[PDB]
mmCIF file of C-alpha atoms and ligand atoms in Angstrom:
data_model
loop_
_atom_site.group_PDB
_atom_site.id
_atom_site.type_symbol
_atom_site.label_atom_id
_atom_site.label_comp_id
_atom_site.label_asym_id
_atom_site.label_seq_id
_atom_site.Cartn_x
_atom_site.Cartn_y
_atom_site.Cartn_z
ATOM 1 C CA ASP A 1 46.561 62.172 149.477
ATOM 2 C CA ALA A 2 46.758 58.992 147.057
ATOM 3 C CA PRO A 3 49.685 56.772 147.580
ATOM 4 C CA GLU A 4 50.423 57.297 143.804
ATOM 5 C CA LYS A 5 50.649 60.982 144.535
ATOM 6 C CA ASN A 6 52.883 60.796 147.381
ATOM 7 C CA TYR A 7 55.355 58.158 145.703
ATOM 8 C CA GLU A 8 56.047 59.871 142.446
ATOM 9 C CA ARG A 9 55.934 63.307 144.363
ATOM 10 C CA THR A 10 58.795 61.662 146.367
ATOM 11 C CA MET A 11 60.452 60.615 143.482
ATOM 12 C CA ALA A 12 60.198 64.172 141.737
ATOM 13 C CA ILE A 13 61.653 65.224 145.297
ATOM 14 C CA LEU A 14 64.338 62.880 145.247
ATOM 15 C CA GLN A 15 65.363 63.947 141.679
ATOM 16 C CA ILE A 16 65.672 67.493 142.348
ATOM 17 C CA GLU A 17 67.579 67.086 145.338
ATOM 18 C CA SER A 18 69.975 64.291 143.786
ATOM 19 C CA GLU A 19 70.783 66.866 141.048
ATOM 20 C CA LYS A 20 71.507 69.675 143.573
ATOM 21 C CA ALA A 21 73.743 67.354 145.399
ATOM 22 C CA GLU A 22 75.736 66.197 142.562
ATOM 23 C CA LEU A 23 75.943 70.006 141.311
ATOM 24 C CA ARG A 24 77.390 71.003 144.654
ATOM 25 C CA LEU A 25 80.050 68.345 144.654
ATOM 26 C CA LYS A 26 80.977 69.543 140.937
ATOM 27 C CA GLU A 27 80.875 73.039 142.263
ATOM 28 C CA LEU A 28 83.442 72.187 145.045
ATOM 29 C CA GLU A 29 85.475 70.327 142.563
ATOM 30 C CA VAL A 30 85.642 73.089 139.952
ATOM 31 C CA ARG A 31 86.570 75.683 142.681
ATOM 32 C CA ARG A 32 89.531 73.557 143.959
ATOM 33 C CA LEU A 33 90.799 73.041 140.295
ATOM 34 C CA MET A 34 90.281 76.835 139.584
ATOM 35 C CA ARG A 35 92.039 77.886 142.624
ATOM 36 C CA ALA A 36 94.700 75.118 141.934
ATOM 37 C CA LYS A 37 95.529 75.882 138.370
ATOM 38 C CA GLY A 38 94.178 79.524 137.738
ATOM 39 C CA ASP A 39 93.092 78.786 134.273
ATOM 40 C CA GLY A 40 89.224 79.247 134.723
ATOM 41 C CA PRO A 41 87.082 82.441 134.838
ATOM 42 C CA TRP A 42 87.402 82.478 138.656
ATOM 43 C CA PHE A 43 90.096 83.565 140.710
ATOM 44 C CA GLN A 44 91.484 85.752 138.297
ATOM 45 C CA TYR A 45 93.286 88.055 140.477
ATOM 46 C CA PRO A 46 94.249 91.593 138.552
ATOM 47 C CA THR A 47 97.352 91.979 136.756
ATOM 48 C CA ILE A 48 98.884 94.951 135.103
ATOM 49 C CA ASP A 49 97.074 96.261 131.843
ATOM 50 C CA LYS A 50 99.443 96.202 128.784
ATOM 51 C CA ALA A 51 97.577 98.858 127.172
ATOM 52 C CA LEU A 52 99.252 101.371 129.845
ATOM 53 C CA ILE A 53 102.583 100.689 128.221
ATOM 54 C CA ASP A 54 104.031 103.223 126.021
ATOM 55 C CA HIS A 55 105.401 101.926 122.802
ATOM 56 C CA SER A 56 106.918 105.387 121.435
ATOM 57 C CA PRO A 57 110.219 105.890 120.372
ATOM 58 C CA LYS A 58 112.001 106.945 123.648
ATOM 59 C CA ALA A 59 114.852 109.374 124.344
ATOM 60 C CA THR A 60 117.512 106.730 124.461
ATOM 61 C CA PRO A 61 117.618 103.850 122.117
ATOM 62 C CA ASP A 62 118.294 100.766 124.305
ATOM 63 C CA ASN A 63 114.903 100.010 126.046
ATOM 64 C CA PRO B 1 122.564 81.817 132.025
ATOM 65 C CA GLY B 2 124.270 82.220 128.741
ATOM 66 C CA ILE B 3 127.571 84.013 127.511
ATOM 67 C CA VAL B 4 127.479 87.575 126.746
ATOM 68 C CA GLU B 5 128.702 88.164 123.036
ATOM 69 C CA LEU B 6 131.108 91.337 122.950
ATOM 70 C CA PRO B 7 132.903 92.151 119.732
ATOM 71 C CA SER B 8 136.607 92.092 119.996
ATOM 72 C CA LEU B 9 139.049 95.004 120.442
ATOM 73 C CA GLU B 10 139.970 94.693 116.870
ATOM 74 C CA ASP B 11 136.105 95.017 115.765
ATOM 75 C CA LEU B 12 135.952 98.511 117.671
ATOM 76 C CA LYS B 13 138.964 100.281 115.991
ATOM 77 C CA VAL B 14 137.993 103.180 113.945
ATOM 78 C CA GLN B 15 139.466 106.441 113.184
ATOM 79 C CA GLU B 16 137.814 108.696 116.000
ATOM 80 C CA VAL B 17 136.846 112.395 115.494
ATOM 81 C CA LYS B 18 139.935 113.551 117.554
ATOM 82 C CA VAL B 19 138.385 117.457 117.910
ATOM 83 C CA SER B 20 137.026 118.891 120.829
ATOM 84 C CA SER B 21 133.295 119.816 121.501
ATOM 85 C CA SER B 22 133.630 123.592 120.328
ATOM 86 C CA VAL B 23 134.701 122.062 117.204
ATOM 87 C CA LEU B 24 131.984 120.051 116.672
ATOM 88 C CA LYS B 25 129.320 122.557 118.170
ATOM 89 C CA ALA B 26 130.812 125.330 115.903
ATOM 90 C CA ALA B 27 130.204 122.893 112.657
ATOM 91 C CA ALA B 28 126.930 121.246 113.962
ATOM 92 C CA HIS B 29 124.669 122.682 111.806
ATOM 93 C CA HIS B 30 126.542 121.972 108.540
ATOM 94 C CA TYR B 31 127.265 118.261 109.878
ATOM 95 C CA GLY B 32 123.583 117.909 110.208
ATOM 96 C CA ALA B 33 122.928 119.047 106.682
ATOM 97 C CA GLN B 34 125.522 117.417 104.826
ATOM 98 C CA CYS B 35 125.941 114.162 107.027
ATOM 99 C CA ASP B 36 122.457 113.674 107.158
ATOM 100 C CA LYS B 37 122.090 109.958 105.496
ATOM 101 C CA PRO B 38 124.593 107.847 107.420
ATOM 102 C CA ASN B 39 123.776 109.579 110.674
ATOM 103 C CA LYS B 40 120.101 108.748 110.352
ATOM 104 C CA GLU B 41 120.604 105.196 108.864
ATOM 105 C CA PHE B 42 122.872 104.865 111.897
ATOM 106 C CA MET B 43 120.157 106.061 114.451
ATOM 107 C CA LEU B 44 117.360 104.370 112.844
ATOM 108 C CA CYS B 45 119.450 100.980 113.140
ATOM 109 C CA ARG B 46 120.018 102.465 116.927
ATOM 110 C CA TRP B 47 116.361 102.605 117.552
ATOM 111 C CA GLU B 48 115.311 99.391 115.815
ATOM 112 C CA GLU B 49 117.874 96.988 116.927
ATOM 113 C CA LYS B 50 118.054 98.382 120.518
ATOM 114 C CA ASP B 51 121.492 96.745 120.619
ATOM 115 C CA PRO B 52 124.855 98.818 119.921
ATOM 116 C CA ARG B 53 126.691 95.349 119.074
ATOM 117 C CA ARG B 54 124.297 95.119 115.750
ATOM 118 C CA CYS B 55 124.955 98.958 115.008
ATOM 119 C CA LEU B 56 128.583 98.800 114.878
ATOM 120 C CA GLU B 57 129.133 98.806 110.663
ATOM 121 C CA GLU B 58 126.926 101.870 110.402
ATOM 122 C CA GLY B 59 128.406 103.645 113.376
ATOM 123 C CA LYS B 60 131.797 103.198 111.521
ATOM 124 C CA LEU B 61 129.967 104.880 108.497
ATOM 125 C CA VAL B 62 129.137 107.918 110.972
ATOM 126 C CA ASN B 63 132.802 107.994 111.943
ATOM 127 C CA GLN B 64 133.514 107.690 107.995
ATOM 128 C CA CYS B 65 131.500 110.885 106.897
ATOM 129 C CA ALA B 66 132.190 113.156 110.132
ATOM 130 C CA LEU B 67 135.881 113.109 108.777
ATOM 131 C CA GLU B 68 135.353 113.734 105.404
ATOM 132 C CA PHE B 69 133.043 116.589 106.506
ATOM 133 C CA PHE B 70 136.205 118.016 108.450
ATOM 134 C CA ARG B 71 138.682 117.566 105.918
ATOM 135 C CA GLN B 72 136.291 119.202 103.483
ATOM 136 C CA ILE B 73 136.289 122.176 105.844
ATOM 137 C CA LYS B 74 140.024 121.925 106.316
ATOM 138 C CA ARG B 75 140.926 122.024 102.835
ATOM 139 C CA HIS B 76 138.960 125.157 101.870
ATOM 140 C CA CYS B 77 138.135 127.236 104.788
ATOM 141 C CA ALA B 78 140.061 126.191 107.605
ATOM 142 C CA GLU B 79 140.985 129.746 108.989
ATOM 143 C CA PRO B 80 137.367 131.258 109.072
ATOM 144 C CA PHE B 81 136.107 128.349 110.853
ATOM 145 C CA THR B 82 139.106 128.177 113.192
ATOM 146 C CA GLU B 83 138.416 131.534 114.312
ATOM 147 C CA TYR B 84 134.626 130.576 114.615
ATOM 148 C CA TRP B 85 135.260 127.612 116.604
ATOM 149 C CA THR B 86 137.756 129.375 118.915
ATOM 150 C CA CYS B 87 135.434 132.254 119.459
ATOM 151 C CA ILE B 88 132.580 129.555 120.337
ATOM 152 C CA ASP B 89 135.260 127.759 122.755
ATOM 153 C CA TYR B 90 135.875 131.010 124.575
ATOM 154 C CA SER B 91 132.213 130.857 125.971
ATOM 155 C CA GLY B 92 131.273 128.832 129.195
ATOM 156 C CA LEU B 93 127.893 127.797 127.943
ATOM 157 C CA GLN B 94 129.064 128.272 124.392
ATOM 158 C CA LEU B 95 126.668 130.468 123.066
ATOM 159 C CA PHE B 96 125.743 130.915 119.378
ATOM 160 C CA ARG B 97 124.411 134.350 120.110
ATOM 161 C CA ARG B 98 127.988 135.736 121.220
ATOM 162 C CA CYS B 99 129.800 134.700 117.960
ATOM 163 C CA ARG B 100 127.529 135.889 115.219
ATOM 164 C CA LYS B 101 130.258 137.788 112.961
ATOM 165 C CA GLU B 102 132.327 134.789 112.848
ATOM 166 C CA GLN B 103 129.557 132.883 112.013
ATOM 167 C CA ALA B 104 128.592 134.974 109.090
ATOM 168 C CA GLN B 105 132.119 134.925 107.941
ATOM 169 C CA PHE B 106 132.170 131.074 108.186
ATOM 170 C CA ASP B 107 128.775 130.880 106.610
ATOM 171 C CA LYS B 108 129.812 133.123 103.639
ATOM 172 C CA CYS B 109 133.118 131.326 102.946
ATOM 173 C CA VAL B 110 131.341 127.813 103.318
ATOM 174 C CA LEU B 111 128.395 128.970 100.688
ATOM 175 C CA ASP B 112 130.940 130.414 98.328
ATOM 176 C CA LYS B 113 133.748 127.754 98.418
ATOM 177 C CA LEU B 114 131.620 124.630 99.020
ATOM 178 C CA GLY B 115 128.050 125.509 98.469
ATOM 179 C CA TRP B 116 126.600 124.282 101.824
ATOM 180 C CA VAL B 117 123.019 126.118 103.047
ATOM 181 C CA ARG B 118 123.076 126.394 106.637
ATOM 182 C CA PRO B 119 119.804 124.856 108.135
ATOM 183 C CA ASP B 120 117.443 126.957 109.393
ATOM 184 C CA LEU B 121 115.375 127.531 112.753
ATOM 185 C CA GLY B 122 113.179 124.412 112.602
ATOM 186 C CA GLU B 123 114.847 122.062 110.337
ATOM 187 C CA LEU B 124 117.376 119.810 112.026
ATOM 188 C CA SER B 125 114.710 118.747 114.322
ATOM 189 C CA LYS B 126 112.587 117.094 111.927
ATOM 190 C CA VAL B 127 111.629 113.441 111.699
ATOM 191 C CA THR B 128 112.937 112.177 108.147
ATOM 192 C CA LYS B 129 112.704 108.851 106.293
ATOM 193 C CA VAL B 130 115.534 106.774 105.623
ATOM 194 C CA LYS B 131 115.711 104.123 102.980
ATOM 195 C CA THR B 132 117.717 101.183 104.192
ATOM 196 C CA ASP B 133 118.118 97.656 102.745
ATOM 197 C CA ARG B 134 118.869 96.110 105.949
ATOM 198 C CA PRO B 135 115.839 93.952 107.162
ATOM 199 C CA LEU B 136 113.565 95.266 109.971
ATOM 200 C CA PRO B 137 113.838 93.163 113.319
ATOM 201 C CA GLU B 138 111.297 90.889 113.844
ATOM 202 C CA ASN B 139 112.079 90.529 117.470
ATOM 203 C CA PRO B 140 114.214 93.210 118.980
ATOM 204 C CA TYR B 141 113.421 92.580 122.606
ATOM 205 C CA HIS B 142 114.565 88.737 122.021
ATOM 206 C CA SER B 143 111.209 88.186 123.553
ATOM 207 C CA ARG B 144 109.601 84.747 123.803
ATOM 208 C CA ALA B 145 106.258 82.929 123.467
ATOM 209 C CA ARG B 146 103.278 84.853 125.339
ATOM 210 C CA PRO B 147 101.699 82.423 127.141
ATOM 211 C CA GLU B 148 98.001 81.296 125.999
ATOM 212 C CA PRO B 149 95.158 83.240 127.588
ATOM 213 C CA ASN B 150 92.429 82.026 129.481
ATOM 214 C CA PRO B 151 89.281 80.985 127.504
ATOM 215 C CA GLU B 152 86.614 83.733 127.073
ATOM 216 C CA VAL B 153 82.812 83.190 127.807
ATOM 217 C CA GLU B 154 80.574 82.149 124.966
ATOM 218 C CA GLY B 155 76.875 80.714 124.748
ATOM 219 C CA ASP B 156 73.666 82.123 125.809
ATOM 220 C CA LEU B 157 73.320 82.484 129.820
ATOM 221 C CA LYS B 158 70.730 80.154 130.703
ATOM 222 C CA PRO B 159 69.250 80.293 134.299
ATOM 223 C CA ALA B 160 70.701 78.655 137.372
ATOM 224 C CA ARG B 161 69.948 74.991 137.831
ATOM 225 C CA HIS B 162 67.547 74.589 140.725
ATOM 226 C CA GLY B 163 68.100 78.234 141.858
ATOM 227 C CA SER B 164 70.947 79.052 144.271
ATOM 228 C CA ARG B 165 71.543 75.693 145.737
ATOM 229 C CA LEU B 166 72.348 77.035 149.355
ATOM 230 C CA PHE B 167 71.301 74.490 151.547
ATOM 231 C CA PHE B 168 67.702 74.530 151.487
ATOM 232 C CA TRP B 169 66.550 77.780 149.248
ATOM 233 C CA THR B 170 64.643 76.347 146.467
ATOM 234 C CA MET B 171 65.063 79.683 144.488
HETATM 235 C C1 CDL C 1 48.037 85.799 137.032
HETATM 236 C C2 CDL C 1 49.187 86.414 137.580
HETATM 237 C C3 CDL C 1 49.222 86.713 138.951
HETATM 238 C C4 CDL C 1 49.039 85.250 139.807
HETATM 239 C C5 CDL C 1 48.946 85.601 141.188
HETATM 240 C C6 CDL C 1 49.040 83.919 141.902
HETATM 241 C C7 CDL C 1 49.714 84.414 143.753
HETATM 242 C C8 CDL C 1 48.968 85.468 144.474
HETATM 243 C C9 CDL C 1 49.953 85.860 145.759
HETATM 244 C C10 CDL C 1 51.080 86.268 145.446
HETATM 245 C C11 CDL C 1 51.948 86.739 146.444
HETATM 246 C C12 CDL C 1 52.839 85.657 147.275
HETATM 247 C C13 CDL C 1 52.117 84.899 148.540
HETATM 248 C C14 CDL C 1 52.923 83.676 149.137
HETATM 249 C C15 CDL C 1 53.474 82.748 147.859
HETATM 250 C C16 CDL C 1 53.957 81.419 148.623
HETATM 251 C C17 CDL C 1 55.293 81.604 149.536
HETATM 252 C C18 CDL C 1 55.230 80.510 150.523
HETATM 253 O O1 CDL C 1 54.302 80.346 151.474
HETATM 254 O O2 CDL C 1 56.512 79.867 150.367
HETATM 255 C C19 CDL C 1 56.371 78.394 151.126
HETATM 256 C C20 CDL C 1 57.570 78.425 151.956
HETATM 257 C C21 CDL C 1 58.314 77.115 151.064
HETATM 258 O O3 CDL C 1 57.444 75.982 151.155
HETATM 259 P P1 CDL C 1 57.224 74.861 150.057
HETATM 260 O O4 CDL C 1 56.434 73.541 150.582
HETATM 261 O O5 CDL C 1 58.706 74.357 149.846
HETATM 262 O O6 CDL C 1 56.674 75.319 148.841
HETATM 263 C C22 CDL C 1 55.571 76.045 148.728
HETATM 264 C C23 CDL C 1 55.628 77.062 147.736
HETATM 265 O O7 CDL C 1 55.251 76.562 146.257
HETATM 266 C C24 CDL C 1 56.912 77.736 147.593
HETATM 267 O O8 CDL C 1 57.278 78.248 146.193
HETATM 268 P P2 CDL C 1 58.534 78.696 145.733
HETATM 269 O O9 CDL C 1 59.533 77.501 145.583
HETATM 270 O O10 CDL C 1 58.643 79.616 144.560
HETATM 271 O O11 CDL C 1 58.986 79.597 146.908
HETATM 272 C C25 CDL C 1 60.559 80.185 147.004
HETATM 273 C C26 CDL C 1 61.103 80.044 148.483
HETATM 274 C C27 CDL C 1 60.848 78.677 148.782
HETATM 275 O O12 CDL C 1 61.380 78.453 150.297
HETATM 276 C C28 CDL C 1 62.657 77.974 150.173
HETATM 277 O O13 CDL C 1 63.188 77.682 149.796
HETATM 278 C C29 CDL C 1 62.613 77.379 151.646
HETATM 279 C C30 CDL C 1 63.461 78.839 152.609
HETATM 280 C C31 CDL C 1 62.367 79.848 152.890
HETATM 281 C C32 CDL C 1 62.985 80.759 154.112
HETATM 282 C C33 CDL C 1 63.409 79.968 155.327
HETATM 283 C C34 CDL C 1 64.193 80.706 156.417
HETATM 284 C C35 CDL C 1 64.403 80.092 157.652
HETATM 285 C C36 CDL C 1 64.898 81.001 158.649
HETATM 286 C C37 CDL C 1 64.247 82.238 158.987
HETATM 287 C C38 CDL C 1 62.943 81.866 159.452
HETATM 288 C C39 CDL C 1 62.477 83.170 159.932
HETATM 289 C C40 CDL C 1 60.943 83.319 161.017
HETATM 290 C C41 CDL C 1 59.962 82.231 160.475
HETATM 291 C C42 CDL C 1 58.539 83.281 160.124
HETATM 292 C C43 CDL C 1 58.135 83.661 161.615
HETATM 293 C C44 CDL C 1 57.092 84.858 161.205
HETATM 294 C C45 CDL C 1 57.516 86.017 160.701
HETATM 295 O O14 CDL C 1 60.910 81.055 149.244
HETATM 296 C C46 CDL C 1 61.723 81.761 149.208
HETATM 297 O O15 CDL C 1 62.812 81.858 148.908
HETATM 298 C C47 CDL C 1 61.166 83.347 150.094
HETATM 299 C C48 CDL C 1 61.162 83.128 151.366
HETATM 300 C C49 CDL C 1 60.005 82.906 152.619
HETATM 301 C C50 CDL C 1 59.008 83.761 152.039
HETATM 302 C C51 CDL C 1 57.603 83.349 151.663
HETATM 303 C C52 CDL C 1 56.648 84.573 151.077
HETATM 304 C C53 CDL C 1 56.196 85.478 152.405
HETATM 305 C C54 CDL C 1 55.175 86.560 151.816
HETATM 306 C C55 CDL C 1 54.425 86.823 152.997
HETATM 307 C C56 CDL C 1 55.295 87.424 154.110
HETATM 308 C C57 CDL C 1 54.595 87.234 155.290
HETATM 309 C C58 CDL C 1 55.571 86.677 156.495
HETATM 310 C C59 CDL C 1 56.212 85.256 156.179
HETATM 311 C C60 CDL C 1 57.189 84.797 157.194
HETATM 312 C C61 CDL C 1 58.532 85.695 157.207
HETATM 313 C C62 CDL C 1 59.711 84.841 157.040
HETATM 314 C C63 CDL C 1 59.732 84.023 155.791
HETATM 315 O O16 CDL C 1 57.594 78.030 153.172
HETATM 316 C C64 CDL C 1 58.505 78.426 154.077
HETATM 317 O O17 CDL C 1 59.489 78.777 153.677
HETATM 318 C C65 CDL C 1 57.996 78.520 155.396
HETATM 319 C C66 CDL C 1 57.297 79.690 156.045
HETATM 320 C C67 CDL C 1 56.035 80.015 155.219
HETATM 321 C C68 CDL C 1 56.019 80.666 154.098
HETATM 322 C C69 CDL C 1 55.078 82.473 154.206
HETATM 323 C C70 CDL C 1 54.015 82.034 154.230
HETATM 324 C C71 CDL C 1 52.950 82.944 153.443
HETATM 325 C C72 CDL C 1 51.722 83.180 153.645
HETATM 326 C C73 CDL C 1 51.776 84.052 154.987
HETATM 327 C C74 CDL C 1 50.277 84.727 155.258
HETATM 328 C C75 CDL C 1 50.084 84.826 156.906
HETATM 329 C C76 CDL C 1 51.127 85.791 157.303
HETATM 330 C C77 CDL C 1 50.738 86.143 158.796
HETATM 331 C C78 CDL C 1 51.470 87.632 159.294
HETATM 332 C C79 CDL C 1 52.955 87.552 159.192
HETATM 333 C C80 CDL C 1 53.529 86.590 160.152
HETATM 334 C C81 CDL C 1 53.908 86.867 161.433
#
């Protein structure tokens, strides 16, 4: 292979792997912030549905 | 937390209906007919406010309208009603079915002297509409601001950047 070919191919390899490394560091920081704050789409552990609640007029009024 | 706010003892004083339960059960159908409107205003206020302290005045109207129901029985048909609630009062379960002749005499004397129709089988269990001027309670549960929900997902789903990015897997 030419030195040009190996050189520019190495630059392509370094671009891809540096972008993957920066995205892995971003992924770790996003996971840490979402577990800490609970405001992202991940770590949304289930709570009770409010569609299960009956809002009909019950038997006794104080409710 | 805060002080609970109760009405005073003078706020709760009203002329009670000092009759027994058989006197009430004997006059129950004509009470549900004639004393419809303040009773339904009260029970509407009672299920809408969900707080008895905001329902006292309407409740006093109930205690105003029941007594005038009984005085109008006492002025006209005191003795057939007295025999009828006595016969109701004899029984343990207070059966209407054991006292049909005194019921017929009471209903006849009431329909002649006062013009009240006894409600039929099915009428007093109806759900009726009530015309009030009090406002609808905007927050009867005394609730507060619900928390802001998490933001939804939006945008077109692009492929994963450089695949899985799991240590060396390039897809
Ligand atoms: C017009 C329309 C139609 C046109 C059609 C045109 C094409 C026609 C052919 C289509 C069919 C596909 C043919 C193969 C395509 C190329 C695949 C390839 O070589 O990938 C290179 C792949 C990555 O190399 P690369 O330099 O980065 O990229 C070159 C390609 O562009 C890589 O490209 P990529 O980036 O897309 O690759 C994706 C990713 C790229 O790879 C990675 O991201 C790296 C990680 C890969 C997995 C590493 C796991 C390590 C731990 C486990 C090791 C197990 C033991 C090792 C093997 C022992 C023997 C069994 O690969 C994977 O995720 C798949 C896993 C590897 C399987 C490869 C396909 C094998 C098919 C035949 C199976 C035969 C047995 C294979 C060996 C069994 C184990 C795999 O090389 C390796 O991972 C090393 C192993 C060699 C690969 C398999 C060789 C295939 C040919 C075998 C013939 C001889 C068989 C003898 C008998 C069986 C063995 C006893």
